[PDB]
Amino acid sequence: VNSFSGYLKLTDNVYIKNADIVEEAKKVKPTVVVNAANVYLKHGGGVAGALNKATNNAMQVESDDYIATNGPLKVGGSCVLSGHNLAKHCLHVVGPNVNKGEDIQLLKSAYENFNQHEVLLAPLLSAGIFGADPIHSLRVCVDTVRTNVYLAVFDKNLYDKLVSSFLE
Ligand SMILES: CCNC(=O)c1cc2c(N[C@H](c3ccc4c(c3)S(=O)(=O)NCC4)C(C)C)ncnc2[nH]1
């Protein structure tokens, strides 16, 4: 199904909408919803916290089982877990947290994980508390992702700046 609506096509494979990813996931129930995760899969605040709260903590208990059995992810890495009631799968992806000294070169490695799935609903990696420049994150996405990605950005002001900079 992947019934995405109201998106603006930026490139052949990148679409963008001013929307809350949790709300989009509920309506669309996409095959894959991306989580802006940390290496230990602790979904305490922001986007990760909101996705986890929408599953009524079922994603946190699953992530905890994953970590105990497989160990933490590396910055730029990912893992595929259940999407619970939000999606068929959740692709947890760790972008660099530049506010904590992590390499911005790893933002390319993080978006590369998207290429293992045909269609994904995702947030802007490394934006918000992670400290990366959001327009730079969208540029890395556009150059790196080759599969079909629907980006939800929950801030009209930021959405407008992104669309203006892209001029598309
Ligand atoms: C009301 C429930 N939903 C939310 O809180 C929510 C928030 C939200 C959202 N926020 C964006 C965003 C993008 C990436 C990151 C963050 C925040 S963070 O939480 O600071 N962690 C680092 C990675 C900002 C830039 C506008 N984007 C898309 N959908 C959303 N939904």
JSON list of C-alpha atoms and ligand atoms in Angstrom, two decimals:
[
{"chain": "A", "resi": 1, "resn": "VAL", "atom": "CA", "xyz": [0.00, 0.00, 0.00]},
{"chain": "A", "resi": 2, "resn": "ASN", "atom": "CA", "xyz": [2.51, 2.81, 1.09]},
{"chain": "A", "resi": 3, "resn": "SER", "atom": "CA", "xyz": [-0.29, 5.40, 0.48]},
{"chain": "A", "resi": 4, "resn": "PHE", "atom": "CA", "xyz": [1.81, 8.53, 1.02]},
{"chain": "A", "resi": 5, "resn": "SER", "atom": "CA", "xyz": [-0.17, 11.76, 0.42]},
{"chain": "A", "resi": 6, "resn": "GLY", "atom": "CA", "xyz": [0.68, 15.47, 0.18]},
{"chain": "A", "resi": 7, "resn": "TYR", "atom": "CA", "xyz": [4.40, 14.94, -0.51]},
{"chain": "A", "resi": 8, "resn": "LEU", "atom": "CA", "xyz": [6.49, 17.24, -2.76]},
{"chain": "A", "resi": 9, "resn": "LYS", "atom": "CA", "xyz": [8.78, 15.38, -5.16]},
{"chain": "A", "resi": 10, "resn": "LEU", "atom": "CA", "xyz": [12.34, 16.80, -4.96]},
{"chain": "A", "resi": 11, "resn": "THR", "atom": "CA", "xyz": [14.16, 14.24, -7.11]},
{"chain": "A", "resi": 12, "resn": "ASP", "atom": "CA", "xyz": [13.33, 10.91, -8.80]},
{"chain": "A", "resi": 13, "resn": "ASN", "atom": "CA", "xyz": [13.56, 9.17, -5.47]},
{"chain": "A", "resi": 14, "resn": "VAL", "atom": "CA", "xyz": [13.26, 11.80, -2.71]},
{"chain": "A", "resi": 15, "resn": "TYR", "atom": "CA", "xyz": [9.84, 13.21, -1.56]},
{"chain": "A", "resi": 16, "resn": "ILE", "atom": "CA", "xyz": [9.26, 15.60, 1.39]},
{"chain": "A", "resi": 17, "resn": "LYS", "atom": "CA", "xyz": [6.27, 16.66, 3.57]},
{"chain": "A", "resi": 18, "resn": "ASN", "atom": "CA", "xyz": [5.74, 18.97, 6.58]},
{"chain": "A", "resi": 19, "resn": "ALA", "atom": "CA", "xyz": [4.32, 16.28, 8.90]},
{"chain": "A", "resi": 20, "resn": "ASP", "atom": "CA", "xyz": [4.87, 14.36, 12.16]},
{"chain": "A", "resi": 21, "resn": "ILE", "atom": "CA", "xyz": [6.47, 10.97, 11.19]},
{"chain": "A", "resi": 22, "resn": "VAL", "atom": "CA", "xyz": [4.36, 9.24, 13.92]},
{"chain": "A", "resi": 23, "resn": "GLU", "atom": "CA", "xyz": [1.15, 10.48, 12.33]},
{"chain": "A", "resi": 24, "resn": "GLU", "atom": "CA", "xyz": [2.32, 9.52, 8.81]},
{"chain": "A", "resi": 25, "resn": "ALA", "atom": "CA", "xyz": [3.25, 6.03, 10.01]},
{"chain": "A", "resi": 26, "resn": "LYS", "atom": "CA", "xyz": [-0.19, 5.52, 11.57]},
{"chain": "A", "resi": 27, "resn": "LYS", "atom": "CA", "xyz": [-2.06, 6.60, 8.38]},
{"chain": "A", "resi": 28, "resn": "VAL", "atom": "CA", "xyz": [0.20, 5.01, 5.73]},
{"chain": "A", "resi": 29, "resn": "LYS", "atom": "CA", "xyz": [1.47, 1.87, 7.69]},
{"chain": "A", "resi": 30, "resn": "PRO", "atom": "CA", "xyz": [4.45, 1.83, 5.32]},
{"chain": "A", "resi": 31, "resn": "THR", "atom": "CA", "xyz": [6.62, -1.24, 4.69]},
{"chain": "A", "resi": 32, "resn": "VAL", "atom": "CA", "xyz": [9.54, 0.57, 6.51]},
{"chain": "A", "resi": 33, "resn": "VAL", "atom": "CA", "xyz": [9.69, 3.41, 9.00]},
{"chain": "A", "resi": 34, "resn": "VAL", "atom": "CA", "xyz": [13.13, 4.74, 9.82]},
{"chain": "A", "resi": 35, "resn": "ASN", "atom": "CA", "xyz": [14.04, 5.61, 13.42]},
{"chain": "A", "resi": 36, "resn": "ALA", "atom": "CA", "xyz": [16.69, 8.24, 14.17]},
{"chain": "A", "resi": 37, "resn": "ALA", "atom": "CA", "xyz": [18.27, 5.94, 16.79]},
{"chain": "A", "resi": 38, "resn": "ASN", "atom": "CA", "xyz": [21.46, 5.99, 19.02]},
{"chain": "A", "resi": 39, "resn": "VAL", "atom": "CA", "xyz": [24.06, 3.11, 19.17]},
{"chain": "A", "resi": 40, "resn": "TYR", "atom": "CA", "xyz": [22.38, 1.58, 22.26]},
{"chain": "A", "resi": 41, "resn": "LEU", "atom": "CA", "xyz": [18.81, 1.77, 20.93]},
{"chain": "A", "resi": 42, "resn": "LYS", "atom": "CA", "xyz": [17.51, 3.77, 23.95]},
{"chain": "A", "resi": 43, "resn": "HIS", "atom": "CA", "xyz": [14.48, 5.76, 22.59]},
{"chain": "A", "resi": 44, "resn": "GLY", "atom": "CA", "xyz": [14.16, 8.30, 25.34]},
{"chain": "A", "resi": 45, "resn": "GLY", "atom": "CA", "xyz": [13.39, 11.61, 23.65]},
{"chain": "A", "resi": 46, "resn": "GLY", "atom": "CA", "xyz": [12.67, 13.44, 20.38]},
{"chain": "A", "resi": 47, "resn": "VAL", "atom": "CA", "xyz": [11.72, 11.38, 17.27]},
{"chain": "A", "resi": 48, "resn": "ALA", "atom": "CA", "xyz": [12.88, 8.01, 18.72]},
{"chain": "A", "resi": 49, "resn": "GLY", "atom": "CA", "xyz": [10.93, 8.66, 21.93]},
{"chain": "A", "resi": 50, "resn": "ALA", "atom": "CA", "xyz": [7.78, 9.61, 19.99]},
{"chain": "A", "resi": 51, "resn": "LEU", "atom": "CA", "xyz": [7.96, 6.51, 17.76]},
{"chain": "A", "resi": 52, "resn": "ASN", "atom": "CA", "xyz": [8.50, 4.31, 20.90]},
{"chain": "A", "resi": 53, "resn": "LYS", "atom": "CA", "xyz": [5.59, 5.99, 22.76]},
{"chain": "A", "resi": 54, "resn": "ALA", "atom": "CA", "xyz": [3.29, 5.30, 19.74]},
{"chain": "A", "resi": 55, "resn": "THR", "atom": "CA", "xyz": [4.10, 1.53, 20.09]},
{"chain": "A", "resi": 56, "resn": "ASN", "atom": "CA", "xyz": [3.30, 1.80, 23.91]},
{"chain": "A", "resi": 57, "resn": "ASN", "atom": "CA", "xyz": [6.95, 0.90, 24.70]},
{"chain": "A", "resi": 58, "resn": "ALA", "atom": "CA", "xyz": [6.88, -2.32, 22.57]},
{"chain": "A", "resi": 59, "resn": "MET", "atom": "CA", "xyz": [9.79, -0.99, 20.44]},
{"chain": "A", "resi": 60, "resn": "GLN", "atom": "CA", "xyz": [11.94, -0.26, 23.56]},
{"chain": "A", "resi": 61, "resn": "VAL", "atom": "CA", "xyz": [11.49, -3.78, 24.99]},
{"chain": "A", "resi": 62, "resn": "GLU", "atom": "CA", "xyz": [12.33, -5.30, 21.56]},
{"chain": "A", "resi": 63, "resn": "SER", "atom": "CA", "xyz": [15.42, -2.99, 21.16]},
{"chain": "A", "resi": 64, "resn": "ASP", "atom": "CA", "xyz": [16.59, -4.02, 24.69]},
{"chain": "A", "resi": 65, "resn": "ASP", "atom": "CA", "xyz": [16.39, -7.73, 23.68]},
{"chain": "A", "resi": 66, "resn": "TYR", "atom": "CA", "xyz": [18.35, -6.90, 20.46]},
{"chain": "A", "resi": 67, "resn": "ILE", "atom": "CA", "xyz": [21.13, -5.06, 22.33]},
{"chain": "A", "resi": 68, "resn": "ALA", "atom": "CA", "xyz": [21.58, -7.83, 24.94]},
{"chain": "A", "resi": 69, "resn": "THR", "atom": "CA", "xyz": [21.94, -10.51, 22.21]},
{"chain": "A", "resi": 70, "resn": "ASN", "atom": "CA", "xyz": [23.81, -8.58, 19.43]},
{"chain": "A", "resi": 71, "resn": "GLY", "atom": "CA", "xyz": [25.53, -5.64, 21.18]},
{"chain": "A", "resi": 72, "resn": "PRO", "atom": "CA", "xyz": [25.33, -1.91, 20.24]},
{"chain": "A", "resi": 73, "resn": "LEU", "atom": "CA", "xyz": [25.29, -0.60, 16.66]},
{"chain": "A", "resi": 74, "resn": "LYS", "atom": "CA", "xyz": [28.22, 1.47, 15.28]},
{"chain": "A", "resi": 75, "resn": "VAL", "atom": "CA", "xyz": [27.76, 5.19, 14.26]},
{"chain": "A", "resi": 76, "resn": "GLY", "atom": "CA", "xyz": [26.60, 5.03, 10.63]},
{"chain": "A", "resi": 77, "resn": "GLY", "atom": "CA", "xyz": [25.10, 1.54, 11.12]},
{"chain": "A", "resi": 78, "resn": "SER", "atom": "CA", "xyz": [21.62, 0.08, 11.38]},
{"chain": "A", "resi": 79, "resn": "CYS", "atom": "CA", "xyz": [19.39, -2.85, 12.28]},
{"chain": "A", "resi": 80, "resn": "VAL", "atom": "CA", "xyz": [15.97, -4.02, 11.08]},
{"chain": "A", "resi": 81, "resn": "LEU", "atom": "CA", "xyz": [13.39, -4.80, 13.80]},
{"chain": "A", "resi": 82, "resn": "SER", "atom": "CA", "xyz": [9.57, -5.01, 13.94]},
{"chain": "A", "resi": 83, "resn": "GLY", "atom": "CA", "xyz": [7.57, -1.98, 12.87]},
{"chain": "A", "resi": 84, "resn": "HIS", "atom": "CA", "xyz": [4.90, -2.96, 15.45]},
{"chain": "A", "resi": 85, "resn": "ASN", "atom": "CA", "xyz": [1.62, -1.02, 14.74]},
{"chain": "A", "resi": 86, "resn": "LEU", "atom": "CA", "xyz": [3.48, 1.72, 12.79]},
{"chain": "A", "resi": 87, "resn": "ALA", "atom": "CA", "xyz": [5.03, -0.19, 9.88]},
{"chain": "A", "resi": 88, "resn": "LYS", "atom": "CA", "xyz": [5.91, -3.76, 8.70]},
{"chain": "A", "resi": 89, "resn": "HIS", "atom": "CA", "xyz": [9.58, -3.01, 9.75]},
{"chain": "A", "resi": 90, "resn": "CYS", "atom": "CA", "xyz": [11.51, -0.37, 11.67]},
{"chain": "A", "resi": 91, "resn": "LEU", "atom": "CA", "xyz": [14.96, 0.40, 10.30]},
{"chain": "A", "resi": 92, "resn": "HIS", "atom": "CA", "xyz": [16.89, 1.86, 13.25]},
{"chain": "A", "resi": 93, "resn": "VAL", "atom": "CA", "xyz": [19.71, 4.09, 11.79]},
{"chain": "A", "resi": 94, "resn": "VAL", "atom": "CA", "xyz": [22.45, 5.84, 13.81]},
{"chain": "A", "resi": 95, "resn": "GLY", "atom": "CA", "xyz": [23.56, 9.14, 12.27]},
{"chain": "A", "resi": 96, "resn": "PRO", "atom": "CA", "xyz": [26.55, 11.03, 13.86]},
{"chain": "A", "resi": 97, "resn": "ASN", "atom": "CA", "xyz": [25.79, 13.33, 16.81]},
{"chain": "A", "resi": 98, "resn": "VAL", "atom": "CA", "xyz": [28.11, 16.23, 15.88]},
{"chain": "A", "resi": 99, "resn": "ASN", "atom": "CA", "xyz": [27.20, 18.03, 19.18]},
{"chain": "A", "resi": 100, "resn": "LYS", "atom": "CA", "xyz": [29.13, 15.09, 20.84]},
{"chain": "A", "resi": 101, "resn": "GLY", "atom": "CA", "xyz": [32.13, 15.11, 18.42]},
{"chain": "A", "resi": 102, "resn": "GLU", "atom": "CA", "xyz": [31.12, 12.35, 16.00]},
{"chain": "A", "resi": 103, "resn": "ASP", "atom": "CA", "xyz": [32.31, 12.50, 12.35]},
{"chain": "A", "resi": 104, "resn": "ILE", "atom": "CA", "xyz": [29.89, 14.15, 9.85]},
{"chain": "A", "resi": 105, "resn": "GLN", "atom": "CA", "xyz": [31.47, 11.95, 7.12]},
{"chain": "A", "resi": 106, "resn": "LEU", "atom": "CA", "xyz": [29.44, 9.10, 8.86]},
{"chain": "A", "resi": 107, "resn": "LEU", "atom": "CA", "xyz": [26.15, 10.77, 7.81]},
{"chain": "A", "resi": 108, "resn": "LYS", "atom": "CA", "xyz": [26.80, 9.33, 4.30]},
{"chain": "A", "resi": 109, "resn": "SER", "atom": "CA", "xyz": [27.23, 5.83, 5.85]},
{"chain": "A", "resi": 110, "resn": "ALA", "atom": "CA", "xyz": [23.98, 6.26, 7.82]},
{"chain": "A", "resi": 111, "resn": "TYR", "atom": "CA", "xyz": [21.84, 7.19, 4.71]},
{"chain": "A", "resi": 112, "resn": "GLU", "atom": "CA", "xyz": [23.46, 4.27, 2.80]},
{"chain": "A", "resi": 113, "resn": "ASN", "atom": "CA", "xyz": [21.42, 1.88, 5.02]},
{"chain": "A", "resi": 114, "resn": "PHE", "atom": "CA", "xyz": [18.24, 3.15, 3.36]},
{"chain": "A", "resi": 115, "resn": "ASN", "atom": "CA", "xyz": [19.36, 1.51, 0.07]},
{"chain": "A", "resi": 116, "resn": "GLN", "atom": "CA", "xyz": [18.54, -2.02, 1.35]},
{"chain": "A", "resi": 117, "resn": "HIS", "atom": "CA", "xyz": [14.75, -1.16, 1.26]},
{"chain": "A", "resi": 118, "resn": "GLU", "atom": "CA", "xyz": [12.66, -0.16, -1.78]},
{"chain": "A", "resi": 119, "resn": "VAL", "atom": "CA", "xyz": [10.38, 2.31, 0.00]},
{"chain": "A", "resi": 120, "resn": "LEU", "atom": "CA", "xyz": [10.88, 4.07, 3.36]},
{"chain": "A", "resi": 121, "resn": "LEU", "atom": "CA", "xyz": [9.26, 6.71, 5.53]},
{"chain": "A", "resi": 122, "resn": "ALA", "atom": "CA", "xyz": [12.07, 8.62, 7.32]},
{"chain": "A", "resi": 123, "resn": "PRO", "atom": "CA", "xyz": [13.10, 11.64, 9.37]},
{"chain": "A", "resi": 124, "resn": "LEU", "atom": "CA", "xyz": [16.04, 13.98, 8.52]},
{"chain": "A", "resi": 125, "resn": "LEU", "atom": "CA", "xyz": [19.08, 12.14, 9.99]},
{"chain": "A", "resi": 126, "resn": "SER", "atom": "CA", "xyz": [21.37, 13.93, 12.45]},
{"chain": "A", "resi": 127, "resn": "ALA", "atom": "CA", "xyz": [19.11, 17.06, 12.52]},
{"chain": "A", "resi": 128, "resn": "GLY", "atom": "CA", "xyz": [17.54, 18.46, 15.84]},
{"chain": "A", "resi": 129, "resn": "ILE", "atom": "CA", "xyz": [19.62, 17.51, 18.92]},
{"chain": "A", "resi": 130, "resn": "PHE", "atom": "CA", "xyz": [22.25, 15.69, 16.78]},
{"chain": "A", "resi": 131, "resn": "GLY", "atom": "CA", "xyz": [23.55, 19.10, 15.64]},
{"chain": "A", "resi": 132, "resn": "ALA", "atom": "CA", "xyz": [24.04, 18.55, 11.89]},
{"chain": "A", "resi": 133, "resn": "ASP", "atom": "CA", "xyz": [22.92, 21.33, 9.52]},
{"chain": "A", "resi": 134, "resn": "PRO", "atom": "CA", "xyz": [19.50, 20.09, 8.32]},
{"chain": "A", "resi": 135, "resn": "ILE", "atom": "CA", "xyz": [19.95, 21.42, 4.76]},
{"chain": "A", "resi": 136, "resn": "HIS", "atom": "CA", "xyz": [23.32, 19.53, 4.57]},
{"chain": "A", "resi": 137, "resn": "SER", "atom": "CA", "xyz": [21.51, 16.37, 5.84]},
{"chain": "A", "resi": 138, "resn": "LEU", "atom": "CA", "xyz": [18.93, 16.68, 2.99]},
{"chain": "A", "resi": 139, "resn": "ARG", "atom": "CA", "xyz": [21.81, 17.07, 0.47]},
{"chain": "A", "resi": 140, "resn": "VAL", "atom": "CA", "xyz": [23.56, 13.95, 1.80]},
{"chain": "A", "resi": 141, "resn": "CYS", "atom": "CA", "xyz": [20.16, 12.11, 1.50]},
{"chain": "A", "resi": 142, "resn": "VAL", "atom": "CA", "xyz": [19.61, 13.23, -2.08]},
{"chain": "A", "resi": 143, "resn": "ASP", "atom": "CA", "xyz": [23.12, 12.15, -3.17]},
{"chain": "A", "resi": 144, "resn": "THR", "atom": "CA", "xyz": [23.25, 8.86, -1.28]},
{"chain": "A", "resi": 145, "resn": "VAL", "atom": "CA", "xyz": [19.79, 7.35, -1.29]},
{"chain": "A", "resi": 146, "resn": "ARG", "atom": "CA", "xyz": [18.83, 5.53, -4.48]},
{"chain": "A", "resi": 147, "resn": "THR", "atom": "CA", "xyz": [15.65, 3.75, -3.33]},
{"chain": "A", "resi": 148, "resn": "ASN", "atom": "CA", "xyz": [12.36, 5.70, -2.71]},
{"chain": "A", "resi": 149, "resn": "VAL", "atom": "CA", "xyz": [12.39, 7.79, 0.46]},
{"chain": "A", "resi": 150, "resn": "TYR", "atom": "CA", "xyz": [9.54, 9.85, 1.87]},
{"chain": "A", "resi": 151, "resn": "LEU", "atom": "CA", "xyz": [10.93, 12.38, 4.37]},
{"chain": "A", "resi": 152, "resn": "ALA", "atom": "CA", "xyz": [8.63, 13.76, 7.08]},
{"chain": "A", "resi": 153, "resn": "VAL", "atom": "CA", "xyz": [9.86, 17.05, 8.64]},
{"chain": "A", "resi": 154, "resn": "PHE", "atom": "CA", "xyz": [7.67, 18.17, 11.57]},
{"chain": "A", "resi": 155, "resn": "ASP", "atom": "CA", "xyz": [8.33, 21.97, 11.35]},
{"chain": "A", "resi": 156, "resn": "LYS", "atom": "CA", "xyz": [6.83, 24.17, 8.61]},
{"chain": "A", "resi": 157, "resn": "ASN", "atom": "CA", "xyz": [9.65, 26.75, 9.05]},
{"chain": "A", "resi": 158, "resn": "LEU", "atom": "CA", "xyz": [12.37, 24.14, 8.48]},
{"chain": "A", "resi": 159, "resn": "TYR", "atom": "CA", "xyz": [10.35, 22.45, 5.67]},
{"chain": "A", "resi": 160, "resn": "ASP", "atom": "CA", "xyz": [10.09, 25.81, 3.86]},
{"chain": "A", "resi": 161, "resn": "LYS", "atom": "CA", "xyz": [13.89, 26.48, 4.27]},
{"chain": "A", "resi": 162, "resn": "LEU", "atom": "CA", "xyz": [14.67, 22.98, 2.92]},
{"chain": "A", "resi": 163, "resn": "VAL", "atom": "CA", "xyz": [12.38, 23.31, -0.10]},
{"chain": "A", "resi": 164, "resn": "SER", "atom": "CA", "xyz": [13.72, 26.84, -0.82]},
{"chain": "A", "resi": 165, "resn": "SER", "atom": "CA", "xyz": [17.37, 25.74, -0.67]},
{"chain": "A", "resi": 166, "resn": "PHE", "atom": "CA", "xyz": [16.66, 22.75, -2.89]},
{"chain": "A", "resi": 167, "resn": "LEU", "atom": "CA", "xyz": [14.57, 24.97, -5.29]},
{"chain": "A", "resi": 168, "resn": "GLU", "atom": "CA", "xyz": [12.32, 22.08, -6.33]},
{"chain": "B", "resi": 1, "resn": "LIG", "atom": "C1", "xyz": [4.43, 14.80, 18.57]},
{"chain": "B", "resi": 1, "resn": "LIG", "atom": "C2", "xyz": [5.09, 13.47, 18.33]},
{"chain": "B", "resi": 1, "resn": "LIG", "atom": "N1", "xyz": [6.10, 13.51, 17.26]},
{"chain": "B", "resi": 1, "resn": "LIG", "atom": "C3", "xyz": [7.25, 14.17, 17.39]},
{"chain": "B", "resi": 1, "resn": "LIG", "atom": "O1", "xyz": [7.67, 14.56, 18.48]},
{"chain": "B", "resi": 1, "resn": "LIG", "atom": "C4", "xyz": [8.03, 14.42, 16.16]},
{"chain": "B", "resi": 1, "resn": "LIG", "atom": "C5", "xyz": [9.20, 15.13, 15.99]},
{"chain": "B", "resi": 1, "resn": "LIG", "atom": "C6", "xyz": [9.56, 15.02, 14.60]},
{"chain": "B", "resi": 1, "resn": "LIG", "atom": "C7", "xyz": [10.60, 15.50, 13.75]},
{"chain": "B", "resi": 1, "resn": "LIG", "atom": "N2", "xyz": [11.53, 16.39, 14.19]},
{"chain": "B", "resi": 1, "resn": "LIG", "atom": "C8", "xyz": [12.77, 16.74, 13.48]},
{"chain": "B", "resi": 1, "resn": "LIG", "atom": "C9", "xyz": [13.95, 15.87, 13.88]},
{"chain": "B", "resi": 1, "resn": "LIG", "atom": "C10", "xyz": [14.70, 15.17, 12.94]},
{"chain": "B", "resi": 1, "resn": "LIG", "atom": "C11", "xyz": [15.76, 14.36, 13.33]},
{"chain": "B", "resi": 1, "resn": "LIG", "atom": "C12", "xyz": [16.13, 14.21, 14.67]},
{"chain": "B", "resi": 1, "resn": "LIG", "atom": "C13", "xyz": [15.35, 14.90, 15.61]},
{"chain": "B", "resi": 1, "resn": "LIG", "atom": "C14", "xyz": [14.30, 15.73, 15.21]},
{"chain": "B", "resi": 1, "resn": "LIG", "atom": "S1", "xyz": [15.66, 14.74, 17.32]},
{"chain": "B", "resi": 1, "resn": "LIG", "atom": "O2", "xyz": [14.47, 14.28, 17.96]},
{"chain": "B", "resi": 1, "resn": "LIG", "atom": "O3", "xyz": [16.27, 15.94, 17.80]},
{"chain": "B", "resi": 1, "resn": "LIG", "atom": "N3", "xyz": [16.77, 13.54, 17.39]},
{"chain": "B", "resi": 1, "resn": "LIG", "atom": "C15", "xyz": [17.85, 13.66, 16.40]},
{"chain": "B", "resi": 1, "resn": "LIG", "atom": "C16", "xyz": [17.34, 13.37, 15.01]},
{"chain": "B", "resi": 1, "resn": "LIG", "atom": "C17", "xyz": [13.06, 18.25, 13.64]},
{"chain": "B", "resi": 1, "resn": "LIG", "atom": "C18", "xyz": [14.39, 18.63, 12.98]},
{"chain": "B", "resi": 1, "resn": "LIG", "atom": "C19", "xyz": [11.91, 19.11, 13.09]},
{"chain": "B", "resi": 1, "resn": "LIG", "atom": "N4", "xyz": [10.60, 15.15, 12.45]},
{"chain": "B", "resi": 1, "resn": "LIG", "atom": "C20", "xyz": [9.60, 14.37, 12.01]},
{"chain": "B", "resi": 1, "resn": "LIG", "atom": "N5", "xyz": [8.55, 13.89, 12.68]},
{"chain": "B", "resi": 1, "resn": "LIG", "atom": "C21", "xyz": [8.57, 14.24, 13.98]},
{"chain": "B", "resi": 1, "resn": "LIG", "atom": "N6", "xyz": [7.64, 13.90, 14.93]}
]
